[PDB]
Amino acid sequence: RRGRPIKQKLNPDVPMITGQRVIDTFFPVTKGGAAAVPGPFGAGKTVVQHQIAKWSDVDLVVYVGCGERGNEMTDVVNEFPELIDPNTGESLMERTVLIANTSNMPVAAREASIYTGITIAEYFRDMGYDVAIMADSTSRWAEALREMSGRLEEMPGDEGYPAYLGSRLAEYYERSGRVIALGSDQREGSITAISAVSPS
Amino acid sequence: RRGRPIKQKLNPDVPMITGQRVIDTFFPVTKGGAAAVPGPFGAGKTVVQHQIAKWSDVDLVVYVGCGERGNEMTDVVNEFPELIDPNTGESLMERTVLIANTSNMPVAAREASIYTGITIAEYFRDMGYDVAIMADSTSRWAEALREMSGRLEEMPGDEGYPAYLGSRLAEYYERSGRVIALGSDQREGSITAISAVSPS
Amino acid sequence: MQIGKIIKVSGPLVMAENMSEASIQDMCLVGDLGVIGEIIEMRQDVASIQVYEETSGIGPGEPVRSTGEALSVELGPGIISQMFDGIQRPLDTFMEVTQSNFLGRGVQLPALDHEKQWWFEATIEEGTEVSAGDIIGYVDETKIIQHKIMVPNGIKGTVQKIESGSFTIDDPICVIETEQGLKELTMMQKWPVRRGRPIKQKLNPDVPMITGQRVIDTFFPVTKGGAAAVPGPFGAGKTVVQHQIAKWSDVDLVVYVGCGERGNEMTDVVNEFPELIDPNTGESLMERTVLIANTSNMPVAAREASIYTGITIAEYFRDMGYDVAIMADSTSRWAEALREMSGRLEEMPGDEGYPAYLGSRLAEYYERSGRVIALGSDQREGSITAISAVSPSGGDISEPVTQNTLRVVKVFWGLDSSLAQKRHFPSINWIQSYSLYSTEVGRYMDQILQQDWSDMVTEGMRILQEEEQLNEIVRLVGIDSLSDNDRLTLEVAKSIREDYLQQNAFDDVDTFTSREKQFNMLKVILTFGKEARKALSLGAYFNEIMEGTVAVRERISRSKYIPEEELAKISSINEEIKETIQLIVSEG
Amino acid sequence: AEEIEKTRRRVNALEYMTIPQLEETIYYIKMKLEENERAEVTRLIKVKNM
Amino acid sequence: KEYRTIKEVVGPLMAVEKVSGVKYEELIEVRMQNGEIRRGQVLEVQEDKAMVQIFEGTSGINLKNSSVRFLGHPLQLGVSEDMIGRVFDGLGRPKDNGPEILPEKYLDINGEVINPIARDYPDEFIQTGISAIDHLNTLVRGQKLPVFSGSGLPHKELAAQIARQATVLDSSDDFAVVFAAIGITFEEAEFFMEDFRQTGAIDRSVMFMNLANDPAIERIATPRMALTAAEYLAYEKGMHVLVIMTDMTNYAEALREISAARREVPGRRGYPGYLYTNLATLFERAGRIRGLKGSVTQIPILTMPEDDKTHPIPDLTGYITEGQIILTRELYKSGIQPPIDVLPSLSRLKDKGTGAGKTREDHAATMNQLFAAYAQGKQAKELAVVLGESALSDIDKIYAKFAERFENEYVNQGFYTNRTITETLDLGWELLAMLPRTELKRIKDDLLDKYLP
Amino acid sequence: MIKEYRTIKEVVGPLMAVEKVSGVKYEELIEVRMQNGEIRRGQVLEVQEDKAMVQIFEGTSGINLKNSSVRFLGHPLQLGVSEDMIGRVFDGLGRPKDNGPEILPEKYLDINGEVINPIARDYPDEFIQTGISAIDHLNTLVRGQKLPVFSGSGLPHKELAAQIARQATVLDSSDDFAVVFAAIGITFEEAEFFMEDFRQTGAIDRSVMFMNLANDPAIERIATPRMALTAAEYLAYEKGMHVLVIMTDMTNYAEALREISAARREVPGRRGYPGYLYTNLATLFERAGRIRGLKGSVTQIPILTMPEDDKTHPIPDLTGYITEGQIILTRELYKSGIQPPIDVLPSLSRLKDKGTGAGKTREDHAATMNQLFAAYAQGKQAKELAVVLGESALSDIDKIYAKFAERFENEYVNQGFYTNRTITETLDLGWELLAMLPRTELKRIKDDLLDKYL
Numbered sequence A, B: 001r002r003g004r005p006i007k008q009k010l011n012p013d014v015p016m017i018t019g020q021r022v023i024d025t026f027f028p029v030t031k032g033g034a035a036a037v038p039g040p041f042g043a044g045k046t047v048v049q050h051q052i053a054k055w056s057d058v059d060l061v062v063y064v065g066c067g068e069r070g071n072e073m074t075d076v077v078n079e080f081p082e083l084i085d086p087n088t089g090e091s092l093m094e095r096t097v098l099i100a101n102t103s104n105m106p107v108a109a110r111e112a113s114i115y116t117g118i119t120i121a122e123y124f125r126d127m128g129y130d131v132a133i134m135a136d137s138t139s140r141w142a143e144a145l146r147e148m149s150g151r152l153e154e155m156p157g158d159e160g161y162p163a164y165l166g167s168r169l170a171e172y173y174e175r176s177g178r179v180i181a182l183g184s185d186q187r188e189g190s191i192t193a194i195s196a197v198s199p200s
Numbered sequence C: 001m002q003i004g005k006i007i008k009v010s011g012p013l014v015m016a017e018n019m020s021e022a023s024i025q026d027m028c029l030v031g032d033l034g035v036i037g038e039i040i041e042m043r044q045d046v047a048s049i050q051v052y053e054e055t056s057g058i059g060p061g062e063p064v065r066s067t068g069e070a071l072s073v074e075l076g077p078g079i080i081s082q083m084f085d086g087i088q089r090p091l092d093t094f095m096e097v098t099q100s101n102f103l104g105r106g107v108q109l110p111a112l113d114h115e116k117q118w119w120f121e122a123t124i125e126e127g128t129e130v131s132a133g134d135i136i137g138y139v140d141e142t143k144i145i146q147h148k149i150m151v152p153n154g155i156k157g158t159v160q161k162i163e164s165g166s167f168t169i170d171d172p173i174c175v176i177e178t179e180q181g182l183k184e185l186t187m188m189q190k191w192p193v194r195r196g197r198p199i200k201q202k203l204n205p206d207v208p209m210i211t212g213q214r215v216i217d218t219f220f221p222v223t224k225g226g227a228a229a230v231p232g233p234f235g236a237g238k239t240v241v242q243h244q245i246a247k248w249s250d251v252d253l254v255v256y257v258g259c260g261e262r263g264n265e266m267t268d269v270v271n272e273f274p275e276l277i278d279p280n281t282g283e284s285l286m287e288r289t290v291l292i293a294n295t296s297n298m299p300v301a302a303r304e305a306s307i308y309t310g311i312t313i314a315e316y317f318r319d320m321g322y323d324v325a326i327m328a329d330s331t332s333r334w335a336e337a338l339r340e341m342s343g344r345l346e347e348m349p350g351d352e353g354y355p356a357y358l359g360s361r362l363a364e365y366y367e368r369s370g371r372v373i374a375l376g377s378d379q380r381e382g383s384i385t386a387i388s389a390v391s392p393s394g395g396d397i398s399e400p401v402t403q404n405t406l407r408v409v410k411v412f413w414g415l416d417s418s419l420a421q422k423r424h425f426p427s428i429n430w431i432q433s434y435s436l437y438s439t440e441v442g443r444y445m446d447q448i449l450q451q452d453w454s455d456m457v458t459e460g461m462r463i464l465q466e467e468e469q470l471n472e473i474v475r476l477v478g479i480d481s482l483s484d485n486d487r488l489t490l491e492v493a494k495s496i497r498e499d500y501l502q503q504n505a506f507d508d509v510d511t512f513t514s515r516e517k518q519f520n521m522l523k524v525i526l527t528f529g530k531e532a533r534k535a536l537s538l539g540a541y542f543n544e545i546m547e548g549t550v551a552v553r554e555r556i557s558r559s560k561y562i563p564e565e566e567l568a569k570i571s572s573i574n575e576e577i578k579e580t581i582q583l584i585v586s587e588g
Numbered sequence D: 001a002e003e004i005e006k007t008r009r010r011v012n013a014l015e016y017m018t019i020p021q022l023e024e025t026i027y028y029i030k031m032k033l034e035e036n037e038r039a040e041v042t043r044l045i046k047v048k049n050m
Numbered sequence E: 001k002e003y004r005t006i007k008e009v010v011g012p013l014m015a016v017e018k019v020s021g022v023k024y025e026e027l028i029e030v031r032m033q034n035g036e037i038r039r040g041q042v043l044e045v046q047e048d049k050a051m052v053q054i055f056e057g058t059s060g061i062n063l064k065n066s067s068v069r070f071l072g073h074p075l076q077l078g079v080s081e082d083m084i085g086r087v088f089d090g091l092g093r094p095k096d097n098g099p100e101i102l103p104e105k106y107l108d109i110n111g112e113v114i115n116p117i118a119r120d121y122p123d124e125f126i127q128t129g130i131s132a133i134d135h136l137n138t139l140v141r142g143q144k145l146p147v148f149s150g151s152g153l154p155h156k157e158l159a160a161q162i163a164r165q166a167t168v169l170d171s172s173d174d175f176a177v178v179f180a181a182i183g184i185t186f187e188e189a190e191f192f193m194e195d196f197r198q199t200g201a202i203d204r205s206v207m208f209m210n211l212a213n214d215p216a217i218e219r220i221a222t223p224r225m226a227l228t229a230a231e232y233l234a235y236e237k238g239m240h241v242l243v244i245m246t247d248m249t250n251y252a253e254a255l256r257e258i259s260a261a262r263r264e265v266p267g268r269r270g271y272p273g274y275l276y277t278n279l280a281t282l283f284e285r286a287g288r289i290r291g292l293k294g295s296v297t298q299i300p301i302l303t304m305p306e307d308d309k310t311h312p313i314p315d316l317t318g319y320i321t322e323g324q325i326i327l328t329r330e331l332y333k334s335g336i337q338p339p340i341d342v343l344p345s346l347s348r349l350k351d352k353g354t355g356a357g358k359t360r361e362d363h364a365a366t367m368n369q370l371f372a373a374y375a376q377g378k379q380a381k382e383l384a385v386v387l388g389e390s391a392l393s394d395i396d397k398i399y400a401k402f403a404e405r406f407e408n409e410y411v412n413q414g415f416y417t418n419r420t421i422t423e424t425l426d427l428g429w430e431l432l433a434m435l436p437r438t439e440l441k442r443i444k445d446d447l448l449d450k451y452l453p
Numbered sequence F: 001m002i003k004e005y006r007t008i009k010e011v012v013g014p015l016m017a018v019e020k021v022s023g024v025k026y027e028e029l030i031e032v033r034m035q036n037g038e039i040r041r042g043q044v045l046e047v048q049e050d051k052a053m054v055q056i057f058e059g060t061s062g063i064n065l066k067n068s069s070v071r072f073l074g075h076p077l078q079l080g081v082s083e084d085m086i087g088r089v090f091d092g093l094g095r096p097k098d099n100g101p102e103i104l105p106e107k108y109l110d111i112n113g114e115v116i117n118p119i120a121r122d123y124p125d126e127f128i129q130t131g132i133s134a135i136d137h138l139n140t141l142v143r144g145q146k147l148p149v150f151s152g153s154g155l156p157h158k159e160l161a162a163q164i165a166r167q168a169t170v171l172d173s174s175d176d177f178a179v180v181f182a183a184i185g186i187t188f189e190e191a192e193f194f195m196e197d198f199r200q201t202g203a204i205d206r207s208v209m210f211m212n213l214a215n216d217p218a219i220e221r222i223a224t225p226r227m228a229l230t231a232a233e234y235l236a237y238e239k240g241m242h243v244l245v246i247m248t249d250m251t252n253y254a255e256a257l258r259e260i261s262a263a264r265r266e267v268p269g270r271r272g273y274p275g276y277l278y279t280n281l282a283t284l285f286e287r288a289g290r291i292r293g294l295k296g297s298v299t300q301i302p303i304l305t306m307p308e309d310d311k312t313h314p315i316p317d318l319t320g321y322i323t324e325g326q327i328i329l330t331r332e333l334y335k336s337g338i339q340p341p342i343d344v345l346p347s348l349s350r351l352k353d354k355g356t357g358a359g360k361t362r363e364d365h366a367a368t369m370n371q372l373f374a375a376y377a378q379g380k381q382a383k384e385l386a387v388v389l390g391e392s393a394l395s396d397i398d399k400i401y402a403k404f405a406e407r408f409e410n411e412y413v414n415q416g417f418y419t420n421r422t423i424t425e426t427l428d429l430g431w432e433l434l435a436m437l438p439r440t441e442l443k444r445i446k447d448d449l450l451d452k453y454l
């Protein structure tokens, strides 16, 4: 829950490659940029995030399954070793880090899954790697906060969500971005945050 | 509040001749079935139920005046004796039981009217008779639950109504139906529920 | 006096012990700064107080003192041409004492000038019978407005001394002994803002107030002592209407209330009013105007009590015998104060956040307006005409404020947004709007002019309603078949809309048209429709008239700008119409 | 003539079917949102007392 | 039983401790420190504590130098038949410079529910003097027939007109009127009060005038005192009483304000959940009773907000009353007075009001033909002006002329024109005289040769 | 007078309780010394007898109740005011980030400020050249006005804000002009965008910046606008400068207001936002204008985003009730390539009539304005007739209007975010587009103006 220290936060210049036409052409995302994928159930948010996680020209990907289907996590560990891309003709599994927290898994562990994944992404950014962090979904994180806020009998903000929902989201994204890592080498790592929102 | 015991419940497949053309032809209700009559003021909810109360081919009729007009209860006790059952050729009042709790009568007492009515119907049902009960109106009953809820400082559900509203109703419409009554001879009786709903 | 001790401060919520002999709804002074507040609720010894100013730097231990009464205004000389605010704090006297262009906290000073000398000339003989509301003498605070010092309410009987001289509002100008005691009478009487001043009897307003606004005075008139409301969106033109009515109303006094307005709009009333010369007197409008100004960032209770302090002062001069007109703009931002204040009182919210007593507080305001006979054996008549301008979020009059307002007001001037653009001003919708005085006003003016004015107004409207019916016929089907007569009704209605309903408040002669002019203008338009339909039958086709009446309809269209002292020219238009359609009747 | 038919028929559809359904739906949802907000706010009032 | 034990004051509410022997809905009297007296009622009593709401609010009250006195009785009304020709306020206090009344007895204004089996069905006819009402939507003794209106509409004139034209064909003096004004402006009240004075209708009526600025609780108590007086005159003195009440919308808003003050959870559209039952405790107080001469008839007049009939106040009123009389802007614009739309309006008990002995033989027959023709006649009138002109098979064209004539000659009578049921029926035939004989199928051939010109 | 207590009773989420206190006032600044020595700042949100409810800005994580202490500073939020603030970048709480030396303050002022006496406020009487034709000509910004910009997420309201700050000026050179720029809830990238663009153009030397990020404490977010205005009222009403305040984003500010609201366990609230949202916006918006007999002025251009772009949202709706007009950004325009995407039809300036006319701008300013607005209105109208009936059905006059509306968008309002136009350049460009019209359609204007200006 504490962001790894940097030396300087930079402006993302280089466009990431997703392989998806509508994204790469009309709504592109840079390395260190932040993107959200809001939509109802069946929209295709999860598919898009897998698609980016498979064809991103970043060095490492980090997929966080926050309060989502367990099969979708099982799906990743199955095919990723079989798929060959993008460099050295090696497995996608040897460039990914998975953090699984299903919907029926305890609620409090949802917020942890988000904060653990971004910290790992911060860790590999410090050695000068372009890393992509997938959040699926940041709504369950908020739902977890809402459910816990009720049990503590706090005064909510809107739709049951705690009023500090705004500030806590701001913390997560400002931990991403292209930065110059601490040290003498002054390497450049980048955290591209591809988040998903599930609006009621 | 406790439904009278039965040996077995049976699926109603015998239609109930009301004399109402639109009903008997296109939207019929079986002996033991349940029908809801929701509509605005001046629609004919009361008239329909009266028509059912008058000319139906059932053994007994239990009419419940739940939070409605007093004139409509005076109208019944006067007219019904002067009317003749199109089958038995005798007065309608010789087969009907009236229960009246008008809108200006005690609010909490209009919940009891519903349960008082259905219990009498179950009683004659166990005799092997085909009974029919009219609820006018069930909306008023729901208001009594809502008002009593507010006095109890209960957590509001939908439109102010308590969360157990759907439960109470579902339990009420399950007390009707074609049954095999208790006894060695295993006789069969039934209750046909006609309920008027008055949505705003 | 009694002091108390703060024990809790959470935002505007302040609780204080030893508030034992304080009362409910008492104005009190919280903390060392002494910021104003009000006692909302009282639980045994502890009183919960809602502070109306910023509570930063205030905490437990600090003293709290009640003023000893509810929110009240000072009624006496030094009140006219003065610019108070919601709690009747003089803004000019403010600048002198604080030596600043800003408003600090805990800085409070008397409304009127107690140090000022006013000449008093008694009109009562000593030993004469007096009661509440009777006049003992007067002060010429200004011409025209003669400030009449009336006997305070609840005071009766004996009159031992009275004399004329240069006194102040503090010095005893009179002494009256009673069963209660022998008290000094001053030139000032305090009065609770919320509660209205009593009267002998309330009468029904039957005398229409001249506004100079054609659409109002003719079709939707307002009697003196009546009640009117102006609902509309942004740029509708309510503020213009308020200014127009404030300028040209045949009333003795004007009370302009700015409930919660933008500062840049508030300065206009501040500066333009002294620059506005008065009707036949020749002085500033401000010298017959009392101003209550409140910006948006002012204390919420100042923005809430605004209209009530105004109606209170209005009652005061009403009791003298003056016909008062109180201007309220805007009331939507007055009610915005209510919504905010009630939220802090943690009450059960009414419709869309507003208090459940919203319609009750509105009713308690508009009811305090009307033609009355004030207390006193003179049985003199006074009146208060309330003109409020409401501002719905998007012009939707389904607003809780507008709906509750239309329940008590008798005159409704609804401003269409579709008329706002295309520059149809005043944008008052002539179909949705109405007047509950229209019938009586029409028969009053049937005597002041001895003409079938009520018949003309009725025919004028009949033409307009028919137009709407004809309008949908045009839509659903097409412009044909015109039937000549129906297409003429459209042209007459178009003439009414453009040559009568529309008037520029910024034009130097169209900003005001008297009854004299209003009559002749309407008569010309109506007689055009009369003579055309009558010649249409035997026997002319529609655009034959339209071709021969080109220049004469231009004169009708320009009748608006015809000077008052040249009123005969409008009458000349009327009989030009009769000759021109016979000019082509023979031969056509 | 077919274009006049189509236009006229579309016009009749716009006035009798499309817009009235639209106005009535914009009224239902608007009131529905206004109701649920009153419900949630009312619920929040009781919670604050706890 | 006077106590100076006021513990708490919050808003209009007040808590009094160390009390005993007090009851629910018990009327109280709070004497303030300045001597001013304020009335109130018990909302709730628990332990030694008593929660009361003051009528005139709680402003300026010093809890420690003020005392509370419990009267040991609910809000009552001192009734007498000397009330005839007297103007009272919402709480039964004189408003006409008249001598205070010596009550023959006091009555709880809540009254009691008429036993459904003791109740007698509404019968016989009340002549309101208005063709649109008396003929098509007949009013009956003991019926609940309300008038649905809107702002700017002439329900005010319609109210006063009926009140001064209302009579029965019974006898000279056994009919009375109880006019209840609720939360209306003073101008509206003075209009009523003096129109009663001018026409002399005051001599047979009792008035309860409550204004918009009067406290909310006095606004909700007004109709209950009106019905209490009405029930006394009708059931104890055997009179046919007609009760006029307006505005019901003001009543609902007053009930709305009181509900929120008591921290009660609101129902649909911010109105109390018990809005139905509360309104029902007023309207159901009307009807005839077996063995008792006289009756209570109610005409509740209300304004429909945004002209929305689905609004809680009209919709719930419709769920209680036996029909309605609807005023429309479309007719008021046309200059129709009274602007009564006979299509969405209806009377349920008109069956008991019409018929030989009550009204003449063709009452029931003519209303069917007039209504049916008007339904077909208006659409004929409407389709003519929109589509085409004077091309309506020459049968709808005469229906169009019938509809317009029906609106301007039959319905539009004026607010100061009394139309007896005789004059109405005769006028109805003259309107049916336009049409060919084939159109009037609803009427048998016998009546036609007896009345039709 | 130290007032430091090791007394700490409770920590519930963001809030912290402290007993045995005295002399502690409402909204008083505090500092908490933790067991590891880590020092965090906070503020009193509620104080009752022998107790105090405070909220720690930087969170409460790691805080041990038994080994920690809380010191009361005995003063609310204040600003070290000075004239040396110009050319420097301050944060939410007026602390430097430009790595420069902290300022020796003339004095300290509360950030709440005082309410301007309405009888002391003067007319807003003259022009402010923003360099935007859509603004300077049709929706004029007068000196002392409060003219907000209505935008949405995705719309270029940051390029517009940056463009105004550089190009804004008074055309009398005998008046010191300054720009107070407040960033609220702003992400680092667009926060950097402002800071770098303020330096590359040398706008910093004329301006004072207040940068607050989204991840920074919500109390700082609330304090940021009041920090910017306190400076603005000093530079103007004490140092006699013409100050232009730019604030963005105002939606971010409102969200923080909601966050502190539920922290005090207050209840919503229209669409989630607290019931006092109106005043809370008024308390920082109404702090502008011109004061009588006082050189200098305060002018505000607050920029907010519309949630899903509807003007019925509380933030745009209530803002319109406090400000005189608004500038509306449209997604339709932006998608088509018009920069800046200013929709002229629904945008308004109520105080434009006073900032124009001879001596302020040219004589033809009001005539060209009304004509362009009308021609464009009927121009856009003629276009939607050409899509239903085809260009063949349009009259020759309407076809010109149709072509007018097109070029009015592509040339007149489509300046570009890096294209500064003077008031004269704008006016004459208006005539070039009015020359497009037939002479018979130009009879509306005074023939005096037609002759002198093309």
Ligand SMILES: Nc1ncnc2c1ncn2[C@@H]1O[C@H](COP(=O)(O)OP(=O)(O)O)[C@@H](O)[C@H]1O
Pocket: A039, A040, A041, A042, A043, A044, A045, A046, A047, A048
């Ligand atoms: N880019 C795509 N290509 C093909 N099919 C898709 C795509 N996106 C979604 N789908 C289909 O839609 C369904 C929704 O997928 P998913 O991402 O799980 O929805 P969401 O995550 O939005 O709830 C998938 O089962 C898939 O079959």
Ligand SMILES: Nc1ncnc2c1ncn2[C@@H]1O[C@H](COP(=O)(O)OP(=O)(O)O)[C@@H](O)[C@H]1O
Pocket: B039, B040, B041, B042, B043, B044, B045, B046, B047, B048, E319, E347, E348
């Ligand atoms: N089947 C029917 N035949 C004839 N008239 C009817 C019929 N149903 C209803 N009506 C008319 O409609 C009115 C409404 O009757 P009622 O049943 O009391 O309405 P609801 O119960 O829907 O409030 C009655 O007064 C009656 O005149």
Ligand SMILES: Nc1ncnc2c1ncn2[C@@H]1O[C@H](COP(=O)(O)OP(=O)(O)O)[C@@H](O)[C@H]1O
Pocket: C232, C233, C234, C235, C236, C237, C238, C239, C240, C241, C425, C426, C503, C504, C505, C506
């Ligand atoms: N009667 C009128 N005559 C001429 N112009 C008017 C009139 N009423 C309004 N306007 C114009 O409409 C604009 C709106 O003015 P204002 O009264 O402030 O509207 P609102 O009060 O609705 O904000 C003004 O700038 C004015 O030029």
Ligand SMILES: [Mg+2]
Pocket: A045, A046
């Ligand atoms: Mg998914």
Ligand SMILES: [Mg+2]
Pocket: B045, B046, B068, E319
């Ligand atoms: Mg019914």
Ligand SMILES: [Mg+2]
Pocket: C238, C239
């Ligand atoms: Mg205005």
